Amino acid sequence: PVIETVQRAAAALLGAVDPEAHFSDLGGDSLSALTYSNFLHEIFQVEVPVSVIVSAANNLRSVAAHIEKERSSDRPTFASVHGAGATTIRASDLKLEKFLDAQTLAAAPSLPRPASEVRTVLLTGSNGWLGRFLALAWLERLVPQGGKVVVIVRGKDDKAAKARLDSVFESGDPALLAHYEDLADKGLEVLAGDFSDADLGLRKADWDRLADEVDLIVHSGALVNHVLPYSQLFGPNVVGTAEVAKLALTKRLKPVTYLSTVAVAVGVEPSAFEEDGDIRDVSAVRSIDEGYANGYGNSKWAGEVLLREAYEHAGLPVRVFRSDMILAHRKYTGQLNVPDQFTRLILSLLATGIAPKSFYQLDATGGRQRAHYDGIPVDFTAEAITTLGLAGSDGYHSFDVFNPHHDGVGLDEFVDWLVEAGHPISRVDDYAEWLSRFETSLRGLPEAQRQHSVLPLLHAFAQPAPAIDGSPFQTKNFQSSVQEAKVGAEHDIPHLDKALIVKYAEDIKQLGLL
Ligand SMILES: *P(=O)(O)OCC(C)(C)[C@@H](O)C(=O)NCCC(=O)NCCS
Protein backbone atom coordinates (compact mmCIF):
# COMPACT_ATOMS: atom_id res chain seq x y z
CA PRO A 1 0.00 0.00 0.00
CA VAL A 2 1.39 3.35 -1.19
CA ILE A 3 0.83 5.35 2.04
CA GLU A 4 2.84 2.75 4.04
CA THR A 5 5.91 3.16 1.81
CA VAL A 6 5.47 6.97 1.96
CA GLN A 7 5.35 6.79 5.80
CA ARG A 8 8.31 4.42 6.18
CA ALA A 9 10.51 6.32 3.69
CA ALA A 10 9.84 9.58 5.59
CA ALA A 11 10.65 7.92 8.94
CA ALA A 12 13.94 6.51 7.60
CA LEU A 13 14.91 9.80 5.95
CA LEU A 14 14.12 12.18 8.83
CA GLY A 15 14.81 9.98 11.91
CA ALA A 16 11.26 9.53 13.27
CA VAL A 17 4.85 8.98 11.14
CA ASP A 18 1.13 9.86 10.91
CA PRO A 19 -0.41 10.12 7.36
CA GLU A 20 -1.90 13.55 8.32
CA ALA A 21 1.60 14.93 9.14
CA HIS A 22 3.29 17.47 6.89
CA PHE A 23 6.81 16.73 5.64
CA SER A 24 8.10 20.05 7.07
CA ASP A 25 6.67 19.29 10.56
CA LEU A 26 8.79 16.09 10.67
CA GLY A 27 12.09 18.02 10.21
CA GLY A 28 11.88 18.11 6.40
CA ASP A 29 13.06 20.91 4.10
CA SER A 30 13.35 21.46 0.30
CA LEU A 31 16.69 19.52 0.11
CA SER A 32 15.70 16.45 2.12
CA ALA A 33 12.51 16.69 -0.01
CA LEU A 34 14.71 16.19 -3.11
CA THR A 35 16.17 12.99 -1.59
CA TYR A 36 12.60 11.89 -0.72
CA SER A 37 11.37 12.75 -4.22
CA ASN A 38 14.14 10.71 -5.93
CA PHE A 39 13.62 7.75 -3.57
CA LEU A 40 9.87 7.60 -4.27
CA HIS A 41 10.42 8.24 -7.99
CA GLU A 42 12.68 5.15 -8.30
CA ILE A 43 10.33 2.95 -6.23
CA PHE A 44 7.07 3.79 -8.07
CA GLN A 45 8.42 4.82 -11.53
CA VAL A 46 6.33 8.04 -11.60
CA GLU A 47 7.06 11.74 -11.08
CA VAL A 48 6.95 12.76 -7.40
CA PRO A 49 7.91 16.48 -7.47
CA VAL A 50 9.38 18.35 -4.51
CA SER A 51 6.47 20.82 -4.83
CA VAL A 52 3.93 18.06 -4.00
CA ILE A 53 5.97 17.10 -0.91
CA VAL A 54 6.54 20.67 0.50
CA SER A 55 3.29 22.52 -0.39
CA ALA A 56 1.52 23.90 2.71
CA ALA A 57 -1.70 22.36 1.31
CA ASN A 58 -0.27 18.77 1.37
CA ASN A 59 0.39 16.06 3.96
CA LEU A 60 1.85 12.55 3.43
CA ARG A 61 -1.63 11.33 2.44
CA SER A 62 -1.52 13.92 -0.43
CA VAL A 63 1.86 12.53 -1.54
CA ALA A 64 0.47 8.96 -1.60
CA ALA A 65 -2.62 10.16 -3.51
CA HIS A 66 -0.38 11.85 -6.08
CA ILE A 67 1.55 8.59 -6.58
CA GLU A 68 -1.65 6.49 -6.95
CA LYS A 69 -3.04 8.95 -9.53
CA GLU A 70 0.18 8.90 -11.61
CA ARG A 71 0.24 5.07 -11.60
CA SER A 72 -3.27 4.86 -13.16
CA SER A 73 -2.51 7.40 -15.96
CA ASP A 74 -2.29 15.22 -18.77
CA ARG A 75 -0.41 18.43 -17.91
CA PRO A 76 2.66 19.70 -19.79
CA THR A 77 5.92 18.07 -18.63
CA PHE A 78 9.65 18.42 -19.18
CA ALA A 79 9.39 15.42 -21.56
CA SER A 80 6.41 16.72 -23.59
CA VAL A 81 8.05 20.18 -24.05
CA HIS A 82 11.85 19.63 -24.22
CA GLY A 83 12.07 15.89 -25.06
CA ALA A 84 12.86 13.18 -22.48
CA GLY A 85 16.47 13.03 -21.26
CA ALA A 86 17.39 16.35 -22.93
CA THR A 87 20.50 18.03 -21.47
CA THR A 88 19.99 21.23 -23.52
CA ILE A 89 16.81 23.30 -23.95
CA ARG A 90 15.85 25.77 -26.70
CA ALA A 91 13.55 28.80 -26.76
CA SER A 92 11.88 27.20 -29.83
CA ASP A 93 10.77 24.26 -27.60
CA LEU A 94 8.56 26.67 -25.61
CA LYS A 95 5.53 27.25 -27.83
CA LEU A 96 2.07 28.08 -26.47
CA GLU A 97 0.44 25.11 -28.28
CA LYS A 98 2.20 22.79 -25.79
CA PHE A 99 0.72 24.63 -22.73
CA LEU A 100 -2.62 26.21 -23.71
CA ASP A 101 -5.64 24.69 -25.47
CA ALA A 102 -6.34 25.52 -29.12
CA GLN A 103 -9.62 27.35 -28.35
CA THR A 104 -7.92 29.84 -26.00
CA LEU A 105 -5.16 30.45 -28.57
CA ALA A 106 -7.59 30.89 -31.50
CA ALA A 107 -9.74 33.44 -29.61
CA ALA A 108 -6.79 35.35 -28.09
CA PRO A 109 -5.74 37.79 -30.89
CA SER A 110 -9.25 39.30 -31.13
CA LEU A 111 -9.82 39.74 -27.35
CA PRO A 112 -10.87 43.13 -25.93
CA ARG A 113 -7.90 45.39 -25.16
CA PRO A 114 -6.74 46.20 -21.58
CA ALA A 115 -9.04 48.31 -19.37
CA SER A 116 -8.07 52.04 -19.27
CA GLU A 117 -8.37 52.08 -15.43
CA VAL A 118 -6.77 49.47 -13.15
CA ARG A 119 -9.27 48.79 -10.31
CA THR A 120 -8.60 45.07 -9.63
CA VAL A 121 -5.16 43.40 -9.49
CA LEU A 122 -4.37 39.67 -9.18
CA LEU A 123 -1.11 39.09 -7.37
CA THR A 124 0.80 35.86 -7.23
CA GLY A 125 3.43 35.10 -4.54
CA SER A 126 2.03 37.55 -1.96
CA ASN A 127 3.37 35.70 1.13
CA GLY A 128 6.83 35.64 -0.45
CA TRP A 129 9.53 38.20 0.17
CA LEU A 130 8.94 40.67 -2.67
CA GLY A 131 5.25 39.83 -3.13
CA ARG A 132 4.17 40.99 0.35
CA PHE A 133 5.42 44.51 -0.47
CA LEU A 134 3.90 44.42 -3.96
CA ALA A 135 0.59 43.54 -2.21
CA LEU A 136 1.00 46.45 0.18
CA ALA A 137 1.90 48.87 -2.64
CA TRP A 138 -1.23 47.88 -4.62
CA LEU A 139 -3.48 48.04 -1.54
CA GLU A 140 -2.16 51.58 -0.77
CA ARG A 141 -3.08 52.70 -4.31
CA LEU A 142 -6.37 50.82 -4.80
CA VAL A 143 -8.16 50.87 -1.41
CA PRO A 144 -8.70 54.69 -1.47
CA GLN A 145 -10.14 54.27 -5.02
CA GLY A 146 -12.56 51.47 -3.95
CA GLY A 147 -10.41 48.90 -5.80
CA LYS A 148 -9.38 45.35 -4.91
CA VAL A 149 -6.25 43.22 -4.67
CA VAL A 150 -6.91 39.48 -5.05
CA VAL A 151 -4.14 37.09 -4.01
CA ILE A 152 -3.64 33.33 -4.55
CA VAL A 153 -1.77 31.60 -1.70
CA ARG A 154 -0.97 27.92 -1.17
CA GLY A 155 -2.89 26.32 1.69
CA LYS A 156 -5.34 23.54 2.54
CA ASP A 157 -8.31 25.98 2.34
CA ASP A 158 -9.04 29.77 2.13
CA LYS A 159 -8.83 30.20 5.92
CA ALA A 160 -5.39 28.52 6.16
CA ALA A 161 -4.14 30.49 3.12
CA LYS A 162 -5.20 33.79 4.72
CA ALA A 163 -3.45 32.82 7.99
CA ARG A 164 -0.16 32.15 6.15
CA LEU A 165 -0.32 35.57 4.44
CA ASP A 166 -1.29 37.43 7.64
CA SER A 167 1.64 35.87 9.53
CA VAL A 168 4.35 37.41 7.27
CA PHE A 169 3.36 40.94 8.38
CA GLU A 170 3.88 39.93 12.07
CA SER A 171 7.61 40.52 12.61
CA GLY A 172 7.73 42.70 15.78
CA ASP A 173 6.81 45.92 13.92
CA PRO A 174 3.54 47.45 15.24
CA ALA A 175 3.29 50.04 12.45
CA LEU A 176 3.60 47.37 9.75
CA LEU A 177 0.89 45.22 11.32
CA ALA A 178 -1.51 48.15 11.83
CA HIS A 179 -0.97 49.36 8.25
CA TYR A 180 -1.54 45.85 6.81
CA GLU A 181 -4.70 45.16 8.86
CA ASP A 182 -6.15 48.58 7.95
CA LEU A 183 -5.72 47.97 4.20
CA ALA A 184 -6.32 44.17 4.09
CA ASP A 185 -9.79 44.29 5.68
CA LYS A 186 -10.87 46.93 3.11
CA GLY A 187 -9.31 45.65 -0.15
CA LEU A 188 -7.67 42.19 0.10
CA GLU A 189 -9.28 38.95 -1.11
CA VAL A 190 -7.34 35.73 -0.29
CA LEU A 191 -7.97 32.53 -2.24
CA ALA A 192 -6.31 29.18 -1.62
CA GLY A 193 -4.81 27.93 -4.86
CA ASP A 194 -1.79 26.74 -6.81
CA PHE A 195 -0.68 28.32 -10.11
CA SER A 196 0.95 25.05 -11.30
CA ASP A 197 -2.57 23.42 -11.48
CA ALA A 198 -5.44 23.88 -13.93
CA ASP A 199 -7.55 27.02 -13.29
CA LEU A 200 -4.80 28.16 -10.85
CA GLY A 201 -6.05 25.49 -8.37
CA LEU A 202 -9.25 27.51 -7.82
CA ARG A 203 -12.96 26.75 -7.82
CA LYS A 204 -14.29 27.11 -11.36
CA ALA A 205 -16.64 29.98 -10.36
CA ASP A 206 -13.73 31.98 -8.90
CA TRP A 207 -11.51 31.43 -11.96
CA ASP A 208 -14.35 32.59 -14.28
CA ARG A 209 -14.96 35.64 -12.07
CA LEU A 210 -11.25 36.58 -12.13
CA ALA A 211 -11.17 36.17 -15.94
CA ASP A 212 -13.85 38.91 -16.03
CA GLU A 213 -12.86 41.21 -13.10
CA VAL A 214 -9.03 41.29 -13.09
CA ASP A 215 -7.47 44.27 -14.93
CA LEU A 216 -3.80 43.52 -14.30
CA ILE A 217 -1.77 40.50 -13.15
CA VAL A 218 1.43 40.67 -11.09
CA HIS A 219 3.19 37.30 -11.33
CA SER A 220 5.79 37.35 -8.53
CA GLY A 221 5.32 33.73 -7.42
CA ALA A 222 7.87 31.02 -8.12
CA LEU A 223 9.86 28.24 -6.52
CA VAL A 224 13.06 30.19 -5.80
CA ASN A 225 15.74 27.61 -5.12
CA HIS A 226 19.45 27.68 -6.07
CA VAL A 227 20.09 23.91 -5.66
CA LEU A 228 17.09 22.13 -7.27
CA PRO A 229 17.35 20.97 -10.92
CA TYR A 230 15.26 22.38 -13.80
CA SER A 231 12.93 19.33 -13.87
CA GLN A 232 11.82 20.08 -10.27
CA LEU A 233 11.25 23.80 -11.06
CA PHE A 234 9.46 23.19 -14.38
CA GLY A 235 6.01 22.76 -12.78
CA PRO A 236 5.93 25.88 -10.60
CA ASN A 237 7.98 28.27 -12.75
CA VAL A 238 7.22 27.29 -16.39
CA VAL A 239 3.79 25.62 -16.31
CA GLY A 240 2.82 28.13 -13.60
CA THR A 241 3.67 31.08 -15.85
CA ALA A 242 1.63 29.50 -18.67
CA GLU A 243 -1.40 29.17 -16.31
CA VAL A 244 -1.09 32.84 -15.40
CA ALA A 245 -0.85 33.70 -19.13
CA LYS A 246 -4.02 31.68 -19.79
CA LEU A 247 -6.00 33.89 -17.40
CA ALA A 248 -4.45 36.97 -19.04
CA LEU A 249 -5.62 35.58 -22.44
CA THR A 250 -9.23 34.72 -21.41
CA LYS A 251 -12.33 36.98 -21.75
CA ARG A 252 -10.20 40.15 -22.04
CA LEU A 253 -6.51 41.06 -22.15
CA LYS A 254 -4.80 41.69 -18.81
CA PRO A 255 -1.30 43.20 -18.78
CA VAL A 256 1.26 41.04 -16.95
CA THR A 257 4.09 42.10 -14.67
CA TYR A 258 6.53 39.15 -14.59
CA LEU A 259 9.34 38.77 -12.07
CA SER A 260 12.56 37.28 -13.44
CA THR A 261 16.20 37.22 -12.34
CA VAL A 262 19.83 38.15 -13.11
CA ALA A 263 20.37 34.35 -13.29
CA VAL A 264 18.87 34.32 -16.86
CA ALA A 265 22.07 36.17 -17.90
CA VAL A 266 24.21 33.14 -16.86
CA GLY A 267 25.72 31.52 -19.99
CA VAL A 268 25.32 34.79 -21.96
CA GLU A 269 28.12 37.26 -22.64
CA PRO A 270 27.46 40.53 -20.71
CA SER A 271 27.85 42.61 -23.93
CA ALA A 272 25.32 40.30 -25.68
CA PHE A 273 22.80 40.39 -22.77
CA GLU A 274 20.40 42.93 -24.25
CA GLU A 275 18.28 44.30 -21.36
CA ASP A 276 15.28 45.20 -23.54
CA GLY A 277 15.96 42.72 -26.37
CA ASP A 278 14.10 39.59 -27.42
CA ILE A 279 15.08 36.90 -24.88
CA ARG A 280 14.56 34.22 -27.58
CA ASP A 281 17.48 35.74 -29.59
CA VAL A 282 19.60 36.75 -26.56
CA SER A 283 19.41 33.22 -25.11
CA ALA A 284 18.15 30.78 -27.77
CA VAL A 285 19.82 27.68 -26.29
CA ARG A 286 20.78 26.85 -22.70
CA SER A 287 22.29 23.80 -21.05
CA ILE A 288 21.10 21.78 -18.05
CA ASP A 289 24.04 21.10 -15.71
CA GLU A 290 25.32 21.12 -12.10
CA GLY A 291 26.26 24.86 -11.99
CA TYR A 292 25.02 27.16 -9.21
CA ALA A 293 21.33 28.08 -9.70
CA ASN A 294 21.29 26.49 -13.20
CA GLY A 295 17.78 25.05 -12.82
CA TYR A 296 16.43 28.28 -11.34
CA GLY A 297 17.93 30.46 -14.09
CA ASN A 298 16.58 28.11 -16.77
CA SER A 299 13.09 28.02 -15.20
CA LYS A 300 12.78 31.84 -15.10
CA TRP A 301 14.15 32.18 -18.65
CA ALA A 302 11.50 29.67 -19.81
CA GLY A 303 8.73 31.83 -18.33
CA GLU A 304 10.08 34.90 -20.13
CA VAL A 305 10.07 33.01 -23.45
CA LEU A 306 6.42 31.93 -22.97
CA LEU A 307 5.30 35.48 -22.18
CA ARG A 308 7.20 36.79 -25.22
CA GLU A 309 5.33 34.15 -27.28
CA ALA A 310 2.04 35.38 -25.75
CA TYR A 311 2.85 38.98 -26.76
CA GLU A 312 3.72 37.98 -30.35
CA HIS A 313 0.59 35.81 -30.74
CA ALA A 314 -2.04 38.01 -29.00
CA GLY A 315 -0.42 41.42 -28.27
CA LEU A 316 -0.50 40.67 -24.52
CA PRO A 317 1.19 43.62 -22.77
CA VAL A 318 4.10 42.46 -20.58
CA ARG A 319 6.74 44.03 -18.37
CA VAL A 320 9.57 41.81 -17.14
CA PHE A 321 11.65 42.82 -14.13
CA ARG A 322 14.87 40.86 -13.68
CA SER A 323 15.88 41.18 -10.03
CA ASP A 324 19.28 41.11 -8.38
CA MET A 325 19.39 40.40 -4.60
CA ILE A 326 16.34 42.19 -3.11
CA LEU A 327 17.61 43.36 0.31
CA ALA A 328 15.84 44.24 3.57
CA HIS A 329 13.09 46.82 3.99
CA ARG A 330 14.65 50.11 5.18
CA LYS A 331 11.70 51.08 7.45
CA TYR A 332 9.86 47.91 8.63
CA THR A 333 11.70 45.98 11.33
CA GLY A 334 12.10 42.21 11.22
CA GLN A 335 11.54 42.36 7.45
CA LEU A 336 14.36 40.71 5.52
CA ASN A 337 14.41 37.73 3.14
CA VAL A 338 15.46 35.14 5.72
CA PRO A 339 16.30 32.26 3.34
CA ASP A 340 18.22 34.34 0.72
CA GLN A 341 21.95 33.98 0.11
CA PHE A 342 22.83 37.45 1.48
CA THR A 343 20.89 37.11 4.77
CA ARG A 344 22.40 33.64 5.22
CA LEU A 345 25.88 35.13 4.70
CA ILE A 346 25.39 38.04 7.14
CA LEU A 347 23.93 35.70 9.79
CA SER A 348 26.86 33.31 9.26
CA LEU A 349 29.48 36.09 9.61
CA LEU A 350 27.86 37.29 12.86
CA ALA A 351 27.51 33.74 14.20
CA THR A 352 31.02 32.49 13.33
CA GLY A 353 32.77 35.83 14.00
CA ILE A 354 35.20 35.37 11.06
CA ALA A 355 35.41 36.95 7.61
CA PRO A 356 38.03 36.95 4.89
CA LYS A 357 40.27 39.98 4.28
CA SER A 358 38.39 40.16 0.99
CA PHE A 359 35.51 38.24 -0.58
CA TYR A 360 36.92 39.35 -3.96
CA GLN A 361 40.16 38.63 -5.92
CA LEU A 362 43.20 40.36 -4.42
CA ASP A 363 45.48 42.49 -6.66
CA ALA A 364 49.02 41.38 -7.68
CA THR A 365 50.56 42.54 -4.34
CA GLY A 366 47.88 40.78 -2.17
CA GLY A 367 45.76 43.89 -1.51
CA ARG A 368 42.00 44.46 -1.33
CA GLN A 369 40.42 45.76 -4.58
CA ARG A 370 37.42 48.00 -5.29
CA ALA A 371 34.19 45.97 -5.68
CA HIS A 372 30.40 46.35 -5.74
CA TYR A 373 27.47 44.30 -4.39
CA ASP A 374 24.53 44.02 -6.80
CA GLY A 375 21.64 44.65 -4.41
CA ILE A 376 18.59 46.90 -4.14
CA PRO A 377 16.37 47.25 -1.01
CA VAL A 378 12.80 45.90 -1.29
CA ASP A 379 11.06 49.17 -0.40
CA PHE A 380 12.55 50.80 -3.51
CA THR A 381 12.11 47.67 -5.66
CA ALA A 382 8.41 47.29 -4.78
CA GLU A 383 7.64 50.96 -5.58
CA ALA A 384 9.58 50.87 -8.89
CA ILE A 385 8.01 47.61 -10.10
CA THR A 386 4.49 48.79 -9.21
CA THR A 387 4.93 52.22 -10.87
CA LEU A 388 6.57 50.89 -14.09
CA GLY A 389 4.20 47.89 -14.21
CA LEU A 390 1.16 50.18 -13.98
CA ALA A 391 2.52 52.10 -16.99
CA GLY A 392 2.73 48.83 -19.01
CA SER A 393 -0.72 48.72 -20.65
CA ASP A 394 0.87 48.32 -24.12
CA GLY A 395 3.86 46.54 -25.75
CA TYR A 396 6.57 44.25 -24.33
CA HIS A 397 9.53 45.62 -22.38
CA SER A 398 12.11 44.22 -20.00
CA PHE A 399 14.02 45.87 -17.14
CA ASP A 400 17.23 44.85 -15.40
CA VAL A 401 16.60 45.71 -11.75
CA PHE A 402 20.32 45.67 -10.91
CA ASN A 403 22.44 48.13 -8.92
CA PRO A 404 24.70 49.80 -11.56
CA HIS A 405 26.63 52.25 -9.35
CA HIS A 406 30.42 52.38 -9.58
CA ASP A 407 30.47 53.27 -5.87
CA GLY A 408 32.84 50.65 -4.43
CA VAL A 409 30.20 49.47 -1.93
CA GLY A 410 30.56 45.68 -1.67
CA LEU A 411 30.81 42.78 0.77
CA ASP A 412 34.06 44.03 2.36
CA GLU A 413 32.51 47.42 3.20
CA PHE A 414 29.56 45.56 4.80
CA VAL A 415 31.94 43.66 7.11
CA ASP A 416 33.75 46.94 8.01
CA TRP A 417 30.40 48.55 8.84
CA LEU A 418 29.34 45.64 11.07
CA VAL A 419 32.68 45.88 12.95
CA GLU A 420 32.29 49.68 13.30
CA ALA A 421 28.76 49.06 14.72
CA GLY A 422 30.29 46.86 17.48
CA HIS A 423 29.97 43.29 16.14
CA PRO A 424 33.16 41.26 16.72
CA ILE A 425 34.26 39.92 13.32
CA SER A 426 37.98 39.16 12.93
CA ARG A 427 39.60 39.15 9.48
CA VAL A 428 41.40 35.98 8.25
CA ASP A 429 44.03 36.93 5.67
CA ASP A 430 44.06 33.84 3.38
CA TYR A 431 40.70 33.25 1.64
CA ALA A 432 41.10 29.44 1.39
CA GLU A 433 42.01 29.30 5.11
CA TRP A 434 38.95 31.45 5.96
CA LEU A 435 36.65 29.25 3.82
CA SER A 436 37.90 26.13 5.61
CA ARG A 437 37.51 27.57 9.15
CA PHE A 438 34.19 29.22 8.20
CA GLU A 439 32.78 25.81 7.18
CA THR A 440 34.04 24.15 10.39
CA SER A 441 32.54 26.88 12.59
CA LEU A 442 29.21 26.62 10.68
CA ARG A 443 29.02 22.83 11.25
CA GLY A 444 29.61 23.44 14.99
CA LEU A 445 26.59 25.78 15.33
CA PRO A 446 23.25 24.62 16.90
CA GLU A 447 20.83 23.01 14.35
CA ALA A 448 18.44 25.99 13.98
CA GLN A 449 21.28 28.45 13.35
CA ARG A 450 23.09 26.02 11.01
CA GLN A 451 19.91 25.55 8.92
CA HIS A 452 19.54 29.36 8.69
CA SER A 453 23.26 29.74 7.80
CA VAL A 454 24.96 29.90 4.39
CA LEU A 455 26.14 26.23 4.71
CA PRO A 456 23.85 24.70 2.03
CA LEU A 457 25.02 27.41 -0.44
CA LEU A 458 28.73 27.44 0.59
CA HIS A 459 29.80 26.09 -2.85
CA ALA A 460 28.97 29.59 -4.25
CA PHE A 461 32.00 30.87 -2.21
CA ALA A 462 34.51 28.21 -3.44
CA GLN A 463 36.60 30.89 -5.19
CA PRO A 464 36.92 34.61 -4.45
CA ALA A 465 34.50 36.59 -6.63
CA PRO A 466 35.77 38.85 -9.43
CA ALA A 467 36.52 42.41 -8.23
CA ILE A 468 33.90 44.18 -10.35
CA ASP A 469 32.61 47.69 -9.64
CA GLY A 470 29.14 48.49 -10.99
CA SER A 471 27.16 45.88 -12.92
CA PRO A 472 28.54 44.03 -15.99
CA PHE A 473 25.00 44.09 -17.52
CA GLN A 474 22.87 46.82 -19.11
CA THR A 475 20.64 48.73 -16.66
CA LYS A 476 19.78 51.84 -18.63
CA ASN A 477 16.11 51.10 -19.41
CA PHE A 478 15.44 50.49 -15.68
CA GLN A 479 17.61 53.35 -14.38
CA SER A 480 16.24 55.91 -16.87
CA SER A 481 12.59 54.85 -16.36
CA VAL A 482 13.11 55.08 -12.57
CA GLN A 483 14.64 58.58 -12.91
CA GLU A 484 11.85 59.72 -15.25
CA ALA A 485 9.10 58.36 -12.94
CA LYS A 486 10.94 60.00 -9.96
CA VAL A 487 10.75 56.95 -7.72
CA GLY A 488 11.46 57.10 -3.99
CA ALA A 489 13.63 59.65 -2.21
CA GLU A 490 16.50 59.03 -4.63
CA HIS A 491 14.70 59.66 -7.97
CA ASP A 492 17.23 57.02 -9.03
CA ILE A 493 18.45 53.57 -8.01
CA PRO A 494 19.70 53.76 -4.39
CA HIS A 495 23.15 53.09 -2.99
CA LEU A 496 23.49 50.50 -0.24
CA ASP A 497 24.46 52.18 3.04
CA LYS A 498 25.56 51.57 6.63
CA ALA A 499 22.03 52.00 8.05
CA LEU A 500 20.74 49.09 5.89
CA ILE A 501 23.59 46.72 6.87
CA VAL A 502 23.37 47.48 10.60
CA LYS A 503 19.60 46.84 10.30
CA TYR A 504 20.39 43.24 9.20
CA ALA A 505 22.07 42.62 12.58
CA GLU A 506 19.16 44.26 14.44
CA ASP A 507 16.52 42.29 12.42
CA ILE A 508 18.44 39.03 13.03
CA LYS A 509 18.36 39.69 16.80
CA GLN A 510 14.69 40.84 16.71
CA LEU A 511 13.62 37.59 14.97
CA GLY A 512 15.74 35.43 17.35
CA LEU A 513 17.83 33.87 14.57
CA LEU A 514 21.17 34.73 16.24
P1 LIG B 1 15.03 24.59 1.00
O2 LIG B 1 13.89 25.52 0.74
O3 LIG B 1 15.37 24.23 2.43
O4 LIG B 1 16.35 25.11 0.21
C5 LIG B 1 17.45 25.74 0.86
C6 LIG B 1 18.16 26.71 -0.10
C7 LIG B 1 19.36 27.31 0.63
C8 LIG B 1 18.64 25.91 -1.31
C9 LIG B 1 17.17 27.81 -0.54
O10 LIG B 1 16.69 28.53 0.60
C11 LIG B 1 17.74 28.81 -1.51
O12 LIG B 1 17.90 28.49 -2.68
N13 LIG B 1 18.03 30.03 -1.00
C14 LIG B 1 18.52 31.17 -1.75
C15 LIG B 1 17.36 32.05 -2.21
C16 LIG B 1 17.79 33.41 -2.73
O17 LIG B 1 18.95 33.80 -2.58
N18 LIG B 1 16.81 34.13 -3.32
C19 LIG B 1 16.93 35.50 -3.82
C20 LIG B 1 17.88 35.67 -5.02
S21 LIG B 1 17.21 34.90 -6.52
- 101: CA distance to ligand 1 center in Å? 34
Is the Cβ–Cβ distance between 315 and 247 less than 8 Å?
Answer: no
Is the Cβ–Cβ distance between 324 and 293 less than 8 Å?
Answer: no
Helix (H, G, I), strand (E, B) or coil at 210: helix
Helix (H, G, I), strand (E, B) or coil at 150: strand
Within 13 Å and on the Cβ side, how many CA atoms surround 497? 7
Q: Which residues line the annotated binding site for NADP(+)? A: 127-130, 154, 164, 194-195, 220-222, 260, 296, 300, 323
Helix (H, G, I), strand (E, B) or coil at 480: helix
User: Quick one: CATH architecture of 74-514?
Assistant: 3-Layer(aba) Sandwich (3.40)
* Ligand 1 nearest atom to the CA of residue 227, by list position: 8
- 372: CA distance to ligand 1 center in Å? 22
Q: How was this structure determined?
A: X-ray
Decide: 293 in ligand 1 pocket, CB within 6 A: no
- 236: CA distance to ligand 1 center in Å? 15
Helix (H, G, I), strand (E, B) or coil at 188: strand
Listed by start position, the domains of the chain span 1-74, 74-514
CA angle 28, 31, 36 (to 5 degrees): 70
What distances in angstroms separate CA 70 from CA 2, 18, 66, 75, one per listed residue? 12, 23, 6, 11
Q: Resolution for this model in angstroms, one decimal place?
A: 2.3
Q: Is 36 exposed, middle or buried (0-12, 13-18, 19+ CB in 10 A)?
A: buried
- Name beta bridge partners: 400: 322
Which residues fall within 8 angstroms of residue 330, CB to CB, at 6 or more apart?
377, 379, 499, 500, 503
